[PDB]
Design a binder for this molecule. Structure first.
Ligand code: CLA
Ligand code: CLA
Ligand code: CLA
Ligand code: CLA
Ligand code: CLA
Ligand code: CLA
Ligand code: CLA
Ligand code: CLA
Ligand SMILES: CCCCCCCCCCCCCCCC(=O)OC[C@H](COP(=O)(O)OC[C@@H](O)CO)OC(=O)CCCCCCCCCCCCCCC
Ligand SMILES: CC1=C(/C=C/C(C)=C/C=C/C(C)=C/C=C/C=C(C)/C=C/C=C(C)/C=C/C2=C(C)CCCC2(C)C)C(C)(C)CCC1
Ligand code: SF4
Lengths: 165, 74, 147, 144, 740, 74, 41
């Protein structure tokens, strides 16, 4: 298939591991009563466990010889064989939120450098301004590419460089 | 497992290169001290002033790098 | 006082501490910073030192050949090498006790030998040695070259 | 002001006897001797440990290294406002004067001093250590 | 004339200074410009001598801070009683103490942590506690969860009382100085009131609640049928049923006919054979005698009437030929400085903690304590560590008194002066004895290792080869085992079973069996002596060389905490007394690690185990006498053999330990970056990253600075101790909760 | 096999560390700016903060993600 | 009351509040949606 494995639906090792986990869980379940909160929690665990196995089988995951899911990190390969939801979509999601955090922080820094005491507003957060900027950047990438294309993203060579060379 | 370990190895190489390259390029001088070239390679420190400067020589940068070499080959 | 050791650095052979001993051991191969060091003298010392290093290397290899040829079992190892273990050299330690020597005697030998985990046996079997005599000849030759 | 010599018959402050006194740097190499004149009896602190009582009038001590004389000098000067002077004594009967060695302690500038070890350039106007290489010994570029 | 002296409304109550960080000092106040200022804000928060220079204000500060500490302790106790009441299986434990393991914590069913809820027995699920509150509660007589809940509410109320008290005494009624400087009145009131009346009151509670309830519980009736304690207070005839002395009331006490109280104030020795704890009648008799002793001791000092002693007179009368003026001038030292008091009190406090640990494993006081192995190990280990830390603190604050508050003008010829005046002899001989013990105590192990590896086990130090017998400890052991027949005619047994004698077994397990002392014991005891002497060397050297030395003649003017005096005169890194405290911390870690390893392996090899009615089968089979003379013995039989449970705990209800194991290692190895390296390198690296921010206009307007030297060292030792101690914690708990 | 491979790996580590150490000694003792005005060797000294920054970045990235994945699997 | 709000505007208090918010948010998402590994949806 994809580098010599099989999907988990017909994977023999998958069902064996599933049976093993259910077995240990029922083994813990045996010694209590039928109304006890221990048995309530144990049956909740059974339900969550079997639901987890069904969810991993449903999403078309790929298992090796240990019966464990394997993720594929390759744009062409994952997009071709239907696996965009394990690395590709997660990486674009994370890059969105991480750039969002960074951009909000940077806008705060420039917003507070223009005052009379930049250190006080760094140690004592300007909460109205911080919430305001916390909203104002939900679309950051557009503002980022605009700041890039206007040449305000980068300071020129008035940065302090080490002396001497 | 090989994926994870190969990334650990790459971490070792990039880190050790960081320490060594930093020690080499900051050997002429830094901003903590802009006349490091007047002391030679392996000098102790510059004392408690300016917040104290322990292990500032290039010798001490290499000194720190040896530990990483041992780790990575480990 | 103004002691002799060491002669390469006068400022070092001046202080009345034990720093001079350690530093005299430490600045010996720093030819560039001795007293009166020109540039020609630097290159010449480096050249002679290279010769010293080559001598030590070849002498060491002669040592390996000699001990393998004398205390090892290379003559018996070439008949069946998926079997009888390599032998590096033999031990004579007066601190041993009875079960110690009874234990270390392994690989078909007659005394306390220890196994050669160096790969010299396979090297010398591949390149074309077969007996002890050839190894002795090699050892004598390499000692001569080192001299 | 001329260079004064000491009068070695002045009494010593009352003290019990520490461990931390003179070792054999004094027997073979040198030991330092301090002198001051007090106005009223008072308890001071030795720069070895313990407390001693200075006498009403001239006093006299003896120490191993120089930082001890400087410590006692700073303490007697900034706290009690006295004028001490300490010498250097070699172990055969030779006496060298020092501190102040100018009459005036070396903060108030006294006209008639010659400045030594005094380069006349900015700190970043030193030569590279490649251009002082291969000299008689190890040299810093700012030593030339 | 000792009296009350209080000032009115010194400091008003407003939030004004909460919005102004670093208001307390002149240096900190002006606001940040680097990141050193944050760590300086946290470093000098409690340095109450570094705000002002007046005794009175410092004293008021420390008084109210004490109230704060007490309040937080009450919140903690209230939490413990509440969690015992609501989220535990205490009643199911009272129904059957064996086979039902104590549990007092329940986790929430989220990402999978619900596997941590173990099958502790009794139809309950949760995390087994080793803190041993259940045995304490059964010793007090608590039978229901309702009483625990009431105690929880009471604790919370007392906590609020304490915080209000602190607020009151700093802001509304703040005492003057001379209130504090009446140490004699404080001694009388503490010795009498606190210790004595606490002992007397607790004796009352034992006699009237804990004796009868535990008598019924050990008699076999289940806890619900047992009468409530107020029925025991109100109805005399029930007590007359249990102990007939109570039928005579309090007539025997007031006519000196105390011999009739022999039913509930006893002197029998060993243990309760059905329980495994001490006899509670002994405990009550003990607190009664303690209370009489302390109430007698509390009338010793002169406060307002002519009788009693003065401290100055007692001190000034003791002076001999070898010590000049003796103690003249210690009273002025010990009433005008707080760091001296903190030094003495931390010293005796920590040593007291360690003695607590030793007596607490030797003579188990609580019912069903000795057969819960994890509780025994955890309690001994915990009190050991707390003692160690407190003693190191004593060293540190003695040093701080040497630096700051020492004035030689008031202190001329004196015990303190003479100690300073021969510090060289002191430290030299302490150094010698450290090296002597080092060579012998550790070279014995190296020699045994070498001989045992060279084929000749007949030339090593052991019980069968060349022998080293602790003859002294064995003789003392026999002396005390024989004591009930000659030198204690009225006891029925020895004070403990470790002195020798028979075996007490509760529910198949061993409560306590006699302990024998052989060659391995000799060697480990001298290891302990060696490490203790080394730590004493470091700390005492820090104290004596805190003001000046031959190296630095003016070390006093640099202060208590400073990094160096430059690379000159060879190099003077770490010359402050603070760094002596630092290295002392490392050695304290070492010594106490050895102590608790010794205890753990000795107990698992020679005391605990099951009574299978075929002799005694210990947990590890009794391999201490043959293996504790080789380092290979420790590394194999202890560390490698006993880690099988902490490394294989995955998948069971014990995996938290096998997962916090590795994290403890990680923090331990993380400390090494802070210890080994230095701040110049990090300063330059941080500068380059600051450039990488200057490029993108994210220059922080506060300036990034690397840690100062002292802080880097301190953080290093913090991580070091955290990682090491966490590792040992995880290992011990997994092992002894698994197999114990 | 084990001893040979381990031996040569550790030897390689020490040798590479020596290479960077003698780079640092070159910069301190034997470098001359005017002879090297504008070659690649001065260019490398001109933009060294970029080098150290990006080595720092890759070291951080590999560290966080490698250690994180290992801890998650644990 | 102004100074109390400014005290609430200091760094560690806002760190505590905001990290409680973020932690609780992630915890609730992990309760209502148990065991997420892939996105596919
Ligand atoms: C980190 C580097 C890297 C590496 C080693 C690979 C490796 C691979 N990619 Mg790939 N890829 C990457 C990054 C990478 N990808 C990125 C970032 C993108 C988004 C632009 C893609 C987009 C992509 C597509 C659309 C396809 C691949 C394919 C492949 C496979 C064969 C082609 C190949 O190796 O080209 C060498 C790759 C590089 C030198 C790295 C640069 C990345 C380029 C843009 C990808 C080249 C695709 C290639 C021309 C398609 C060849 C078709 C094939 C039938 C011959 C191989 C497993 C093909 C596949 O599915 O194989 C079965 C395919 O169709 N990749
Ligand atoms: C019988 C009287 C008495 C009692 C019981 C105490 C008890 C205590 N004093 Mg104390 N003290 C007394 C008289 C007394 N003192 C006198 C006469 C003076 C003046 C010379 C002082 C001066 C003094 C100072 C300066 C300090 C103490 C401290 C302490 C506490 C030590 C902490 C501890 O281990 O407590 C164990 C905990 C408990 C026993 C909990 C019980 C607590 C309750 C409230 C009992 C307290 C009784 C109370 C003092 C009586 C007056 C109450 C008030 C409403 C009038 C402890 C609560 C230290 C402390 O912690 O400060 C807060 C401290 O710094 N005391
Ligand atoms: C310090 C702790 C303590 C306390 C609180 C008690 C308390 C008690 N013991 Mg006791 N006891 C103790 C230690 C203690 N003991 C010790 C150490 C021993 C061993 C020697 C004994 C040995 C002992 C025996 C042998 C007996 C008791 C008994 C009693 C009870 C009755 C005492 C009695 O006969 O009248 C003593 C009288 C008083 C204490 C006077 C109380 C005055 C009240 C409280 C004043 C209230 C006035 C106020 C204005 C009222 C407000 C009115 C309005 C607001 C409503 C009483 C509950 C007797 C008992 O009942 O057995 C169960 C009994 O037989 N005890
Ligand atoms: C009754 C106990 C007691 C008391 C009242 C004091 C009081 C004091 N000590 Mg002291 N000390 C003690 C015990 C005590 N110490 C012990 C046991 C030791 C040995 C470790 C020391 C070692 C010590 C040193 C070495 C120094 C002091 C100093 C001081 C003074 C300033 C303290 C300060 O600003 O802290 C501010 C508060 C902190 C720094 C808190 C940080 C503490 C650590 C990092 C947290 C512990 C980690 C925790 C257990 C687990 C982490 C949980 C989680 C985050 C992972 C103050 C007078 C200093 C001084 O100069 O005095 C004038 C000083 O230099 N002490
Ligand atoms: C295992 C590592 C280790 C060892 C062996 C030592 C050893 C020592 N430290 Mg130490 N130390 C260490 C780690 C170690 N430290 C660490 C990590 C720290 C940081 C916290 C410190 C911090 C520290 C301080 C702060 C102090 C010491 C002190 C001491 C000395 C105590 C006296 C003693 O026992 O000497 C005896 C020597 C040994 C036990 C070593 C083994 C000797 C063998 C068994 C026999 C030797 C004979 C030999 C085989 C013959 C040679 C033959 C050969 C030439 C062919 C001793 C030299 C103290 C000191 O010097 O004062 C006394 C002291 O003040 N150390
Ligand atoms: C081609 C090989 C080679 C050559 C020719 C040189 C040559 C030189 N190096 Mg260099 N170096 C090399 C490889 C080499 N190095 C490698 C591989 C490293 C990385 C480790 C270094 C790291 C290095 C540093 C960090 C420094 C030099 C320095 C020097 C110069 C002075 C050397 C000196 O005085 O040392 C004297 C040599 C000694 C005192 C020997 C010390 C013994 C070492 C610690 C090994 C001990 C281990 C022990 C034997 C183990 C026994 C085990 C026991 C159980 C039996 C000299 C030009 C120095 C320099 O230029 O000064 C400015 C300098 O600072 N080099
Ligand atoms: C356990 C040992 C250990 C670890 C984890 C590290 C980790 C690191 N070292 Mg190294 N180092 C070590 C030992 C270690 N070192 C030793 C012994 C030495 C010899 C002195 C050095 C010498 C050294 C040098 C000289 C350099 C490093 C550098 C680095 C960084 C490399 C970048 C990286 O991997 O980012 C990954 C970072 C981490 C994994 C840090 C852990 C962060 C945790 C997971 C987050 C916190 C979790 C949680 C919130 C905590 C809650 C607790 C709460 C109370 C706060 C990184 C911080 C280099 C550097 O900084 O380059 C940028 C560098 O220049 N180190
Ligand atoms: C750095 C490496 C790393 C990575 C990649 C992950 C990733 C993951 N962990 Mg994990 N973990 C890590 C480190 C890491 N963790 C560490 C260090 C620990 C120890 C503290 C854990 C402990 C841990 C546990 C105990 C569990 C996870 C779980 C998960 C999964 C849940 C994803 C989630 O939050 O739902 C998705 C959440 C969202 C989509 C909300 C985000 C909101 C934004 C707006 C989304 C934007 C999308 C456009 C996810 C695959 C859980 C799981 O089921 O495992 C598979 C789980 O039970 N991890
Ligand atoms: C033996 C101690 C004799 C001590 C003794 O006999 O002292 C007796 C002597 C009596 O002094 P004075 O009675 O004149 O002092 C009066 C007042 O200062 C105190 O009452 O005390 C000293 O002179 C101190 C000398 C220190 C002696 C240092 C010895 C250190 C030994 C440490 C090792 C102990 C090992 C065993 C530990 C358990
Ligand atoms: C893919 C492949 C290929 C290719 C390969 C290649 C191309 C490779 C390369 C590689 C490389 C490319 C490598 C490199 C490395 C590098 C290094 C290793 C470096 C080092 C450096 C250093 C060490 C430095 C030093 C110094 C300093 C620091 C200062 C200055 C002076 C000096 C320079 C000395 C082929 C086709 C053939 C085949 C197939 C496969
Ligand atoms: S502590 Fe650091 S700064 Fe001070 S002398 Fe030592 S190395 Fe230099």
């Amino acid at each position: 298939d994809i580098a010599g494995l099989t999907p988990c639906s017909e994977s023999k090792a998958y069902a064996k591991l599933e049976k093993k986990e259910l077995k240990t869980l029922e083994k813990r379940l045996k010694q209590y009563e039928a109304d006890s909160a221990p048995a309530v929690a144990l049956k909740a665990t059974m339900e969550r466990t079997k639901a987890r196995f069904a969810n991993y089988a449903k999403a078309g995951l790929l298992c090796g010889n240990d019966g464990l899911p394997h993720l594929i990190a390759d744009p062409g390969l994952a997009l071709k064989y239907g696996h965009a939801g394990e690395v590709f979509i997660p990486t674009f999601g994370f890059l969105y939120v991480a750039g969002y955090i960074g951009y909000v922080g940077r806008q705060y820094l420039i917003a507070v450098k223009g005052e009379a005491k930049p250190t006080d507003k760094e140690i004592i957060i300007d909460v109205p301004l911080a919430t305001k900027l916390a909203w104002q950047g939900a679309g950051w990438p557009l503002a980022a590419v605009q700041e890039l294309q206007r040449g305000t993203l980068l300071e020129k060579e008035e940065n302090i460089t080490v002396s001497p060379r | 497992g090989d994926f994870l370990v190969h990334h650990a190895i790459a971490l070792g190489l990039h880190t050790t290169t960081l320490i060594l390259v930093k020690g080499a390029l900051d050997a002429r001088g830094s901003k903590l001290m802009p006349d490091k070239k007047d002391f030679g390679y392996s000098f102790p420190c510059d004392g408690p002033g300016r917040g104290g400067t322990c292990d500032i020589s290039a010798y001490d940068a290499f000194y720190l790098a040896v530990f990483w070499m041992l780790n990575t080959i480990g | 006082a103004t002691k002799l050791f060491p002669k390469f650095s006068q400022g070092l052979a001046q202080d009345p501490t034990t720093r001079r001993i350690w530093y005299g051991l430490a600045m010996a191969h720093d030819f560039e910073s001795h007293d009166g060091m020109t540039e020609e003298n630097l290159y010449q010392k480096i050249f002679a030192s290279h010769f010293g290093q080559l001598s030590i290397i070849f002498l060491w290899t002669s040592g390996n050949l000699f001990h393998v040829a004398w205390q090892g079992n290379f003559e018996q190892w070439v008949t069946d090498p998926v079997h009888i273990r390599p032998i590096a050299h033999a031990i004579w330690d007066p601190h041993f006790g009875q079960p110690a020597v009874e234990a270390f005697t392994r690989g078909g030998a007659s005394g306390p030998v220890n196994i050669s985990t160096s790969g010299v046996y396979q090297w010398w079997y591949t390149i074309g040695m077969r007996t002890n005599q050839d190894l002795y000849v090699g050892s004598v030759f390499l000692a001569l070259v080192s001299a | 002001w001329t260079v004064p010599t000491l009068n070695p018959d002045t009494p010593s402050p009352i003290f019990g006897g520490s461990t931390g006194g003179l070792l054999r740097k004094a027997q073979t190499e040198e030991f330092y001797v301090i002198t001051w004149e007090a106005k009223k009896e008072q308890i001071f602190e030795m720069p070895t440990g313990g407390a001693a009582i200075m006498r009403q009038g001239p006093n006299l001590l003896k120490f191993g290294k120089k930082e001890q004389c400087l410590a006692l000098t700073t303490q007697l000067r900034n706290k009690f406002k006295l004028t001490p002077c300490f010498y250097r004594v070699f172990p055969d009967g030779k006496v060298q004067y020092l501190h102040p060695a100018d009459g005036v302690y070396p903060e108030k500038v006294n006209a008639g001093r010659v400045g030594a070890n005094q380069n006349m350039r900015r700190i970043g106007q030193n030569v590279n250590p490649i251009k002082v290489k291969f000299s008689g010994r190890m040299m810093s570029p700012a030593e030339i | 004339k000792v009296k009350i002296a209080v000032d009115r409304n010194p400091v008003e109550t407003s939030f004004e200074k909460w919005a102004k960080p670093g208001h307390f000092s002149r240096t900190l106040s002006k606001g940040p410009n680097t990141t050193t200022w944050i760590w300086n804000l946290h470093a000098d928060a409690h340095d109450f001598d570094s705000h002002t220079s007046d005794l009175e204000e410092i004293s008021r500060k420390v008084f109210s801070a004490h109230f704060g500490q007490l309040g937080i302790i009450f919140i903690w106790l209230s939490g413990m009683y509440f969690h015992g009441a609501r989220f535990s299986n205490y009643e199911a434990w009272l129904s059957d103490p064996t086979h039902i393991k104590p549990s007092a914590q329940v986790v929430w069913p989220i990402v999978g942590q619900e596997i941590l809820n173990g099958d502790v027995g009794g139809g309950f699920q949760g995390i087994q506690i080793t803190s041993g509150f259940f045995q304490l509660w059964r010793a007090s007589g608590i039978t229901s969860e309702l009483q625990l809940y009431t105690t929880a509410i009471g604790g919370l109320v007392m906590a609020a009382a304490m915080f209000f008290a602190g607020w009151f005494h700093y802001h509304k009624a703040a005492p003057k100085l001379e209130w504090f400087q009446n140490v004699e009145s404080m001694l009388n009131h503490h010795l009498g009131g606190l210790l004595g009346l606490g002992s007397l009151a607790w004796a009352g509670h034992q006699i009237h609640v804990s004796l009868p309830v535990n008598k019924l519980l050990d008699a076999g009736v289940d806890p619900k049928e047992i009468p409530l304690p107020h029925d025991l207070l109100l109805n005399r005839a029930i007590m007359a049923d249990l102990y007939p002395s109570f039928a005579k009331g309090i007539a025997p006490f007031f006519t000196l006919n105390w011999s009739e109280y022999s039913d509930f104030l006893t002197f029998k020795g060993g243990l309760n054979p059905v329980t495994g704890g001490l006899w509670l009648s002994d405990t009550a008799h003990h607190h009664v005698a303690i209370a009489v002793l302390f109430l007698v001791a509390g009338h010793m000092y002169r406060t307002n009437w002519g009788i009693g002693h003065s401290m100055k007179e007692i001190l000034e009368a003791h002076r001999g030929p070898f010590t000049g003026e003796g103690h003249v001038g210690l009273y002025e030292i010990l009433t005008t400085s707080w760091h001296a008091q903190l030094a003495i009190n931390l010293a005796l406090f920590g040593s007291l903690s360690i003695i607590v640990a030793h007596h607490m494993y030797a003579m188990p006081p609580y019912p069903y304590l000795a057969t819960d192995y994890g509780t025994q190990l955890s309690l001994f280990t915990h009190h050991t560590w707390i003692g160690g830390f407190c003693i190191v603190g004593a060293g540190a604050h003695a040093a701080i008194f040497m630096v700051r508050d020492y004035d030689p003008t008031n202190n001329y010829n004196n015990l303190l002066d003479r100690v300073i005046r021969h510090r060289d002899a002191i430290i030299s001989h302490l150094n010698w004895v450290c090296i002597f013990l080092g060579f012998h105590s550790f070279g014995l192990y190296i020699h045994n290792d070498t001989m045992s590896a060279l084929g000749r086990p007949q030339d090593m130090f052991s019980d069968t080869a060349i022998q080293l017998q602790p003859v002294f400890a064995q003789w003392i052991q026999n002396t005390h085992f024989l004591a009930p027949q000659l030198t204690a005619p009225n006891a029925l047994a020895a004070t403990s079973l470790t002195w020798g004698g028979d075996l007490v077994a509760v529910g198949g397990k061993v409560a306590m069996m006699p302990i024998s002392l052989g060659t391995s014991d000799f060697m480990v005891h001298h290891i302990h002596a060696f490490t203790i002497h080394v730590t004493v060397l470091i700390l005492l050297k820090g104290v004596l060389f805190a003001r000046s030395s031959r190296l630095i003649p003016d070390k006093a003017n640099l202060g208590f905490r400073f990094p160096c005096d430059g690379p000159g005169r060879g190099g003077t890194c770490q010359v402050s007394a603070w760094d002596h405290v630092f290295l002392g911390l490392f050695w304290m870690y070492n010594s106490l690690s050895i102590v608790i390893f010794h205890f753990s392996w000795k107990m698992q090899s020679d005391v605990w185990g099951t009574v299978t009615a075929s002799g005694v089968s210990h947990i590890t089979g009794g391999n201490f006498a043959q293996s504790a003379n080789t380092i290979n013995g420790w590394l194999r039989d202890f560390l490698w053999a006993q880690s099988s449970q902490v490394i294989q705990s995955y998948g069971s209800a014990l995996s938290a330990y096998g997962l916090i194991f590795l994290g403890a290692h990680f923090v331990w190895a993380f400390s090494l970056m802070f210890l080994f390296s230095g701040r110049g390198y990090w300063q330059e690296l941080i500068e380059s990253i600051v450039w990488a921010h200057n490029k993108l206009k994210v220059a922080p307007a506060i300036q990034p600075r690397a840690l100062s030297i002292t802080q880097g060292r301190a953080v290093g030792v913090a991580h070091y101790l955290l990682g090491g101690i966490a590792t040992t914690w995880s290992f011990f708990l997994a092992r002894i909760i698994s197999v114990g | 096999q084990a001893a040979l491979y381990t031996h040569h790996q550790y030897i390689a580590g020490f040798i590479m560390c020596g290479a960077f150490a003698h780079g640092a000694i070159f910069f301190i003792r034997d470098y001359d700016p005017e002879q090297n005005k504008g070659n690649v060797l001065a260019r490398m000294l001109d933009h060294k903060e970029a080098l150290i920054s990006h080595l720092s970045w890759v070291s951080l990235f590999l560290g966080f993600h490698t250690l994180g994945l290992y801890v998650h699997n644990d | 009351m102004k100074d109390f709000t400014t005290y609430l505007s200091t760094a560690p208090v806002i760190a505590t509040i905001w990290f409680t918010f973020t932690a609780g948010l992630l915890i609730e998402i992990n309760r209502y949606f148990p065991d997420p590994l892939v996105f596919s949806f």
